[PDB]
Scaffold this active site. Sequence first.
Site, mmCIF file in Angstrom:
data_model
loop_
_atom_site.group_PDB
_atom_site.id
_atom_site.type_symbol
_atom_site.label_atom_id
_atom_site.label_comp_id
_atom_site.label_asym_id
_atom_site.label_seq_id
_atom_site.Cartn_x
_atom_site.Cartn_y
_atom_site.Cartn_z
ATOM 1 N N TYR A 79 15.977 -8.854 46.417
ATOM 2 C CA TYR A 79 14.767 -9.640 46.203
ATOM 3 C C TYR A 79 13.910 -9.726 47.463
ATOM 4 O O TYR A 79 14.417 -9.617 48.584
ATOM 5 C CB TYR A 79 15.127 -11.048 45.716
ATOM 6 C CG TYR A 79 14.092 -11.669 44.800
ATOM 7 C CD1 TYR A 79 14.103 -11.404 43.431
ATOM 8 C CD2 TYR A 79 13.106 -12.521 45.297
ATOM 9 C CE1 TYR A 79 13.162 -11.972 42.579
ATOM 10 C CE2 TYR A 79 12.156 -13.094 44.452
ATOM 11 C CZ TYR A 79 12.191 -12.816 43.095
ATOM 12 O OH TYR A 79 11.262 -13.373 42.246
ATOM 13 N N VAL A 80 12.612 -9.925 47.267
ATOM 14 C CA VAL A 80 11.665 -10.034 48.372
ATOM 15 C C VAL A 80 11.817 -11.394 49.048
ATOM 16 O O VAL A 80 11.796 -12.430 48.381
ATOM 17 C CB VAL A 80 10.199 -9.889 47.874
ATOM 18 C CG1 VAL A 80 9.235 -9.856 49.053
ATOM 19 C CG2 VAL A 80 10.042 -8.638 47.022
ATOM 20 N N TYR A 122 10.338 -16.608 39.986
ATOM 21 C CA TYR A 122 9.293 -16.341 39.000
ATOM 22 C C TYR A 122 8.660 -17.608 38.455
ATOM 23 O O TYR A 122 7.445 -17.754 38.489
ATOM 24 C CB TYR A 122 9.848 -15.511 37.839
ATOM 25 C CG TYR A 122 10.097 -14.058 38.174
ATOM 26 C CD1 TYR A 122 9.124 -13.292 38.817
ATOM 27 C CD2 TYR A 122 11.295 -13.444 37.827
ATOM 28 C CE1 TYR A 122 9.343 -11.945 39.105
ATOM 29 C CE2 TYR A 122 11.523 -12.100 38.111
ATOM 30 C CZ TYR A 122 10.544 -11.355 38.749
ATOM 31 O OH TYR A 122 10.765 -10.026 39.030
ATOM 32 N N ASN A 140 0.907 1.535 38.398
ATOM 33 C CA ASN A 140 0.476 1.957 39.730
ATOM 34 C C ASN A 140 -0.793 1.226 40.159
ATOM 35 O O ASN A 140 -0.918 0.810 41.311
ATOM 36 C CB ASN A 140 0.248 3.469 39.777
ATOM 37 C CG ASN A 140 0.073 3.984 41.193
ATOM 38 O OD1 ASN A 140 0.982 3.883 42.015
ATOM 39 N ND2 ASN A 140 -1.096 4.540 41.486
ATOM 40 N N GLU A 176 13.226 -5.447 40.693
ATOM 41 C CA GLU A 176 13.732 -5.269 39.337
ATOM 42 C C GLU A 176 13.914 -3.803 38.961
ATOM 43 O O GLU A 176 14.921 -3.437 38.352
ATOM 44 C CB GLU A 176 12.819 -5.977 38.332
ATOM 45 C CG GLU A 176 12.560 -7.454 38.644
ATOM 46 C CD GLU A 176 13.773 -8.357 38.446
ATOM 47 O OE1 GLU A 176 13.566 -9.559 38.189
ATOM 48 O OE2 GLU A 176 14.926 -7.888 38.556
ATOM 49 N N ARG A 179 16.983 -2.675 40.326
ATOM 50 C CA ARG A 179 18.135 -3.366 39.761
ATOM 51 C C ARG A 179 18.581 -2.767 38.429
ATOM 52 O O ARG A 179 19.777 -2.725 38.130
ATOM 53 C CB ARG A 179 17.831 -4.856 39.579
ATOM 54 C CG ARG A 179 17.680 -5.642 40.870
ATOM 55 C CD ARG A 179 17.365 -7.094 40.565
ATOM 56 N NE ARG A 179 17.191 -7.901 41.770
ATOM 57 C CZ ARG A 179 16.821 -9.179 41.765
ATOM 58 N NH1 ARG A 179 16.581 -9.804 40.621
ATOM 59 N NH2 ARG A 179 16.691 -9.838 42.907
HETATM 60 N N1 LIG Z 1 13.521 -15.409 39.839
HETATM 61 C C1 LIG Z 1 14.323 -15.113 40.951
HETATM 62 N N2 LIG Z 1 14.084 -15.707 42.147
HETATM 63 C C2 LIG Z 1 14.841 -15.442 43.240
HETATM 64 O O1 LIG Z 1 14.553 -16.016 44.256
HETATM 65 C C3 LIG Z 1 15.897 -14.528 43.137
HETATM 66 N N3 LIG Z 1 16.670 -14.261 44.279
HETATM 67 C C4 LIG Z 1 16.132 -13.921 41.888
HETATM 68 O O2 LIG Z 1 17.169 -13.007 41.724
HETATM 69 N N4 LIG Z 1 15.337 -14.233 40.835
#
Ligand SMILES: Nc1nc(O)c(N)c(O)n1
Length: 264
Positions: A79-80, A122, A140, A176, A179
């Site tokens: 994750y960012v 989210y 894109n 994602e 993932r």
């Molecule tokens: N919605 C969501 N927020 C986060 O911070 C993380 N780490 C995750 O896997 N999913």
Amino acid sequence: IFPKQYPIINFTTAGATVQSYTNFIRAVRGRLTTGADVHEIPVLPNRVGLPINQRFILVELSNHAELSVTLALDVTNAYVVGYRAGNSAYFFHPDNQEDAEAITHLFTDVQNRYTFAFGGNYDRLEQLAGNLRENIELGNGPLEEAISALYYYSTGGTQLPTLARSFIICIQMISEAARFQYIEGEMRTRIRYNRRSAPDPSVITLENSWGRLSTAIQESNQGAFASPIQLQRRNGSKFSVYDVSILIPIIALMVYRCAPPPQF
Ligand SMILES: Nc1nc(O)c(N)c(O)n1
């Protein structure tokens, strides 16, 4: 550079093709998985004792107008955590005090460093953007637009709702996408046809269930799940999953969960 380098992976929306994108995504996956520890799905490093020097992966997004944005991804969850634009760094509010200790080793060389009050979840970003995932168009183009929004944020373009929306785009198309093979394909097909479309139930459900899946699969009683998990089809219908097999070509990475199986 600050003690111990952080691997960087570049990408650009200029000559964006299915090939370049696929290479990019698979490169990220290939670097996140530090090595071993996996039924048939690669597991992410355990945060509990992961060294700072191997805690983050840097992704440099380059736009058609030469606008770079360095996104920092946490190697344990993909994750960012934050990003650097120009001479400033912006991080999502550290949910845990220990993560703060880690974040302090990122864009140290930058003049300005900020930290948002909100987290990266989210649910939060959607509230700030006033838009659900199933409304924000991916592809894109959106990514190209996201880069710009994140960039000019450090100068005055700002506009919080836009900043929030842009994050949802980047996270889905990068985090994602890396993932799940399924999501990677969804982004790839969009590029394949130069389209823009909001994710449907099948995508969202997977995202919301990533942690749930990782847990169930890693705790599968020898091969079968503890209890079946219900996912959603494209039309919104729901079906039950009992094994990991059907999920093999769907999921790509999982976050560490429990005691490893009794590489020898
Ligand atoms: N919605 C969501 N927020 C986060 O911070 C993380 N780490 C995750 O896997 N999913």
